[PDB]
């Protein structure tokens, strides 16, 4: 049961407005589907001990170009996901050993060039 | 002022079902987002006359392939929006000319070599 997460970005309201809020949305193979329009981020994906995890970027127009550069946050320091480059998607396995609860992080995406992040959590159950 | 419409596919969900209900959404430049769980479908893209449209598809795993196939139905019936396939995505402009209201239109979509449809209807004002 491996999850699979698309990060789709409006590249055009994101350089416009500086800020990927309300311009990034997560859509993963749970069927969860999400937006960011005001406050904290809140966009987040649940998963379970030991589950493979795959995040992929793209855009909303066929022009631009989306890429995850990087990720950051308690998610990697807790060591709870690691991913790693593969292909153009990132790709990592939960560790918790029984604990449960959200792990913050921070993905940094390449918009046209331009870098942004947003802040997301995994859920671990 | 183009709107670029982005169409996700939960390969895995779509294939395993032969449906693409719960597995297929819209998002789109105006910041609309839709997913299709229930009933008959209702994701819809908003334009005015003179508008250009952009359609392309994409899959949330980065291991599979999505592609618009076509259009057929009211939309290119009454020609109120006629797409035509530029590289990877299909682009039309609407040319309604004064009259607005709702189009239905059907997307064929090529799923891992599977044709597939949905049935979303362009609205405009």
């Known amino acids: 049961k491996k999850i699979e997460i698309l990060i789709v970005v409006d590249c055009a309201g994101a350089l416009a407005t500086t800020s ?4 990034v949305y997560l859509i993963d193979s749970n069927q969860w589907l999400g937006s960011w329009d005001e406050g904290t981020c809140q966009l987040h994906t649940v998963s379970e001990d030991g589950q493979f995890i795959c995040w992929r970027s793209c855009a909303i127009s066929p022009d631009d170009e989306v890429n995850i550069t990087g990720f950051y946050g308690d998610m990697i320091d807790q060591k709870a996901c690691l991913p790693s480059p593969v ?5 990592g396995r939960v560790q918790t050993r029984g604990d449960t609860g959200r792990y913050l992080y921070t993905i940094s995406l ?3 060039g331009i870098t942004m992040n947003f802040s997301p959590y995994l859920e671990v159950q």
Chains 1, 2 share one sequence.
Do not use: P, T
Not at 87 to 91: G, K
């Open 110 to 112: 390449s918009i046209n």
């Open 20 to 23: 990927l809020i309300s311009n």
């Open 87 to 91: 292909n153009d998607a990132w790709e």
